[PDB]
């Protein structure tokens, strides 16, 4: 019952997800801690409620239901019931009646992990450091950045040093090697 698009007694009266839910649902079998032989009536659930929920209504409100036309001031005799029941979890229950711990993860400050390579000096590399990129030779430097400075710039606004973010040491980026290939020749008329 725990999804976008799904229906049921929980999905109408306890726990709705938006039908385009930004997130995931995770669940695992918990017979081995949530259940004991006396009946772990510890966990409750909303068996009855008027109208329907919206997504994410944790409506703790607990008063007697009443269906059709009757008044009800407690007593809960007929056509009116107390809205909650316990789960009768016991370690001897069958698989579909066992307890399960559910977690829903629902979705700027959060990110997954961003994973470094080891760092190679004195070779031509296609580098990335924090937000930037380049092609270069990365080399140890005698520059002295201030503690908060992360990059360092050449006079024509071209980056030419960077702080490594893990080991706080300064690299002197050099451009990777390029040059013209000139062919030097006597005339073909002579020799090839």
């Amino acid at each position: 019952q725990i999804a976008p698009g799904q229906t049921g007694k929980i999905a109408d009266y306890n726990y709705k997800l938006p039908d385009d839910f930004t997130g995931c649902v995770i669940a695992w079998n918990s017979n081995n801690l949530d259940s004991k032989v006396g009946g772990n009536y510890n966990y409750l659930y909303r068996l009855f409620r008027k109208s329907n929920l919206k997504p994410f209504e944790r409506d703790i409100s607990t008063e007697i239901y009443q269906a059709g036309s009757t008044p009800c001031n407690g007593v809960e005799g007929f056509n009116c019931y107390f809205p909650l029941q316990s789960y009768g979890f016991q370690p001897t229950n069958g698989v579909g009646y066992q307890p399960y711990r559910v977690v829903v993860l629902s979705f700027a400050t959060v990110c997954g992990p961003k994973k470094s390579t080891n760092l190679v000096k004195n070779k031509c590399v296609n580098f990335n450091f924090n937000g930037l990129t380049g092609t270069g030779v990365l080399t140890e430097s005698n520059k002295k950045f201030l503690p908060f400075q992360q990059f360092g710039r050449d006079i024509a606004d071209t980056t030419d040093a960077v702080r490594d973010p893990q080991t706080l040491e300064i690299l002197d980026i050099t451009p990777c090697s390029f040059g013209g290939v000139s062919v030097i020749t006597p005339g073909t008329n002579t020799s090839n």
């Binding site: 700027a108 400050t109 002295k144 950045f145 908060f148 400075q149 992360q150 990059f151 360092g152």
Partner: protein, 215 residues
């Protein structure tokens, strides 16, 4: 009450090392020789950003409050020194009609003889804190001098801010989008700066991109 800002209110505008170079830049900076409002805890506008500076003798000035409405209607910043710690929180705080110290949250963190200098600005929902500290021996104003505030703290708050107040002398001015020419020295510290739009000689220095000009 008011006083003259002189040449204060320069901070390092981005985290990039520049060395022995006169880098021209535009950002929210305090205009040179503008008036700062002078205080010995009223609620103030924040506008585009604030330069706050505070002369100290006994740890009198403990922190700041920032928001739009500043009374639990929406989330709001509280930054405080309390004895041996610094606190930062962003909660829909109920705030007192006169907040002071004796003798729904999304971000929380808990770790005259002096002048303290601070720049507060809010850009694309990130809130920027730049600051500097120094000894002094002055009793009535910000001392005429030059200092560059390094960044400290750069918080993904996402909150709107248009009003702030202090918690317990201090001085307040507002940042504006102006061109500055910054002299980065041989070690990458900003040792001097020129506010272009100040006077014809500053426009000249900036247009030539030098702190000195021949005839």
């Amino acid at each position: 009450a008011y006083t003259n800002s002189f040449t204060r209110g320069v901070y390092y505008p981005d985290k990039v090392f520049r060395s022995s170079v006169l880098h021209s830049t535009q950002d929210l900076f305090l205009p040179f020789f503008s008036n700062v409002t002078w205080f010995h805890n009223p609620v103030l506008p924040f506008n585009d950003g604030v330069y706050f500076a505070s002369t100290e003798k006994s740890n009198i000035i403990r922190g700041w409050i920032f928001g739009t409405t500043l009374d639990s209607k929406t989330q709001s910043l509280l930054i405080v020194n309390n004895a041996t710690n610094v606190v930062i929180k962003v909660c829909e705080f109920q705030f007192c009609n006169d907040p002071f110290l004796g003798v729904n949250c999304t971000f929380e963190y808990v770790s005259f003889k002096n002048l303290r200098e601070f720049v507060f600005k809010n850009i694309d929902g990130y809130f920027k804190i730049y600051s500097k500290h120094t000894p002094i021996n002055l009793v009535r104003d910000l001392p005429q001098g030059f200092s560059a505030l390094e960044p400290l703290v750069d918080l993904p708050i996402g909150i709107n801010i248009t009003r702030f107040q202090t918690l317990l002398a201090y001085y307040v001015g507002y940042l504006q989008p102006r061109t500055f020419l910054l002299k980065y020295n041989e070690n990458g510290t900003i040792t001097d700066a020129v506010d272009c739009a100040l006077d014809p000689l500053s426009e000249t220095k900036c247009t030539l991109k030098s702190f000195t000009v021949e005839k």
